[PDB]
């Protein structure tokens, strides 16, 4: 029982889960071929003579992101057909990932998801990694949520997105792709966690001291965040918590289901042996505005709920004293209709380190998945991006000429605008 | 098998260990060939290391000390820039504390013996003689070179000279300090030395 299927769509989805499966195999003991020289049942199956295979469905339209995965070190670990590729790219078009090519690929991805679920004996939920602000992560990701809801309904379709940063973008059509993908990000997903490149960039400078980190070092931190989020599932904890309680004791009224991630400590090895790592200090660092992984400063806003993922040699009486210190802090605030908003969680196992990664051996870690009204502003900034492009129909011939009716831009606008009104009426 | 497969250390240790495994099977339920973890290696021979007084110390003298290979050139401007800084790092860890922390083995890519000696006279940590084949073997093992006269086996260069790579007892790459690499921390990659968890056992 208790199986979690991970779905990765896009370049960023493949590369993030690339660090995830590296960390999962290194943690449980599975080598890059499958062999171990039933805690693995959450992310692996088991075939005969210890041939553990990940339950991933890596998905992209271009082959030049996934072909390296099937020719490098982890080519025999992964099942050869789970890595699904089309032939040409989505060209950063939503409509080319949703209205032209992709129908030849979703029939292959849904079938392999079907065999991946037949091997299960009770799925906790569909963990997902995508990149909103592109062609495959936006368009083909939206198509996957449409089909997964109608087929595999009443199941926990978690999502972890790569929402475009306020300043660093690496593209010009992400104002179009981000809010045109937020339909499935609002009506289909459940624990949609917002991540962006810029905030993990600033974390890597401040804590990890890396002045020049790359897509590797960001995906390592996201892999540790996912490892902490599914930690009582794989390992024994004093206060276990599953994906069902993330959807109940962290989520208000149903349309409000966007989170914001945080991790602590992300501190480097040269710093590591110089300071305390007590649970009161680590939740002070986890509640720092600069450690927020959305560039979405929570000093302005109101916390509706907060989920804490203490992990390691963590004593519960020290946890309750730590959250009492957080409650007595005046910088952060909680909404009036939430007396207790501090669902905690403890897993006994200390977090693992990859040999050669940027992190250090740490006794305790906290993953702080919080829902606030501050995250209205990450949609307010793309609201400003969209009406500055679409005011005179920019880049729309590329989308109408491939299948998209012109009004789909405008019903992406009150989909965002009702999202803003909903987040502003919660805190009253 | 670590860090690569096509290196003289790895083929040589593989040959010795599975020959030992065949000898044990002949004098014998043993699996052939042995596992990589079951393989044991002397990383350095008896007379390969010399200190500042040019006196030979054995490989077993390095226990409990975070040791790193320093692939260096006498005439290279990056190596000549990095060397006073490595001297200061050696001082600032090996003076401040009751226990010795870090050792640095010196592997030379210098053109000839006398310029190897002139570069090595400025350097107080351990070194390997240039004409010894162990330097050439370590170059192929850790994939360090300036230009491809050395035939790589479909691989690439892990890094270029200068290189400070923390090494283990059986020859694995513990961690790479990125002096001149894709991460590119000149002068400050030495602070990434995790001497607590990199130990020569």
């Amino acid at each position: 029982m208790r199986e979690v299927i991970s779905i990765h769509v896009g370049q960023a989805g493949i590369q993030i889960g690339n660090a995830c499966w590296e960390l999962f195999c290194l943690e449980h003991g599975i080598q890059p071929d499958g062999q171990m020289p039933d805690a693995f049942n959450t992310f692996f199956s088991e075939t005969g003579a210890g041939k553990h295979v990940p339950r991933c469905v890596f998905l992209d339209l271009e082959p030049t992101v996934v072909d390296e995965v099937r020719t490098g070190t982890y080519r025999h670990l992964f099942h050869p057909e789970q890595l699904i590729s089309g032939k040409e790219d989505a060209a950063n078009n939503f409509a080319r990932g949703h209205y032209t090519i992709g129908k030849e690929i979703v029939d292959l991805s849904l079938d392999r998801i079907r065999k991946l679920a037949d091997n299960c004996t009770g799925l906790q939920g569909f963990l997902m990694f995508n990149a909103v602000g592109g062609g495959t992560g936006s368009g083909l990701g939206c198509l996957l949520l449409e089909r997964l809801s109608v087929d595999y309904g009443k199941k926990s379709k978690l999502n972890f997105c790569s929402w475009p940063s306020p300043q660093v973008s690496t593209a010009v059509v992400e104002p179009y792709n981000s809010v045109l993908s937020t339909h499935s990000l609002l009506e289909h997903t459940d624990v949609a966690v917002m991540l962006d490149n810029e905030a993990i960039y600033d974390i890597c400078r401040r804590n990890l001291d890396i002045e020049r980190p790359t897509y590797t070092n960001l995906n390592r931190l996201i892999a540790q965040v996912i490892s902490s989020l599914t930690a009582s599932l794989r390992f024994d904890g004093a206060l276990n918590v599953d994906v069902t309680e993330f959807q109940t004791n962290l989520v208000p009224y149903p349309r409000i289901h966007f989170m914001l991630s945080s991790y602590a400590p992300i501190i480097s090895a040269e710093k590591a042996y110089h300071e305390q790592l007590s649970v009161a200090e680590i939740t002070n660092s986890a509640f720092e505005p600069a450690s927020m992984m959305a560039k979405c400063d929570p000093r302005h806003g109101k916390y509706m709920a907060c989920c804490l993922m203490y992990r390691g040699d963590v004593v519960p009486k020290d946890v309750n004293a730590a959250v009492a210190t957080i409650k007595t802090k005046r910088t952060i605030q909680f909404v009036d209709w939430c007396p207790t908003g501090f669902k905690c969680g403890i897993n006994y196992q200390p977090p693992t380190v990859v040999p050669g990664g940027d992190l250090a051996k740490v006794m305790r870690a906290v993953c702080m998945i919080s829902n606030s009204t501050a995250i209205a502003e990450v949609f307010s900034r793309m609201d400003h991006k969209f009406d500055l492009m679409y005011a005179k129909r920019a880049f729309v011939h590329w989308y109408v000429g491939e299948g998209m009716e012109e009004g789909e831009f405008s019903e992406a606008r009150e989909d965002l605008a009702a999202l803003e009104k909903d987040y502003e009426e919660v805190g009253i | 098998s670590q860090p690569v497969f096509a290196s003289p250390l790895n083929v040589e240790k593989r040959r010795l260990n599975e020959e030992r495994a065949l000898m044990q099977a002949q004098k014998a339920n043993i699996q052939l060939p042995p596992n990589y973890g079951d393989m044991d290696l002397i990383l350095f021979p008896e007379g390969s290391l010399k200190n500042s007084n040019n006196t030979v110390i054995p490989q077993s003298h390095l226990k409990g000390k975070s040791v790193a290979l320093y692939f260096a050139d006498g005439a290279d401007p990056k190596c000549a820039s990095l060397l006073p800084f490595l001297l200061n790092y050696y001082r600032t860890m090996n003076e401040g504390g009751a226990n010795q922390k870090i050792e640095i083995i010196f592997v030379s890519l210098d053109r000839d013996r006398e310029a190897f000696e002139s570069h090595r006279a400025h350097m107080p940590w351990l070194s390997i003689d240039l004409e010894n084949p162990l330097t050439e073997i370590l170059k192929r093992h850790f994939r360090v070179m300036k230009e491809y006269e050395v035939p790589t086996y479909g691989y690439g260069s892990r890094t270029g000279v200068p290189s400070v790579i923390v090494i283990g007892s059986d020859g694995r790459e513990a961690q790479f300090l990125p002096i001149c690499s894709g991460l590119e921390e000149g002068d400050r990659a030495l602070l990434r030395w995790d001497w607590r968890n990199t130990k020569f056992a």
Binding site: L26, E27, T73, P355 | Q2
Partner: peptide
């Protein structure tokens, strides 16, 4: 690359 496996966590 193929990273070395961490030592097993002995039960306590």
């Amino acid at each position: 690359v193929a990273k070395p496996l961490p030592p097993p966590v002995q039960t306590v």
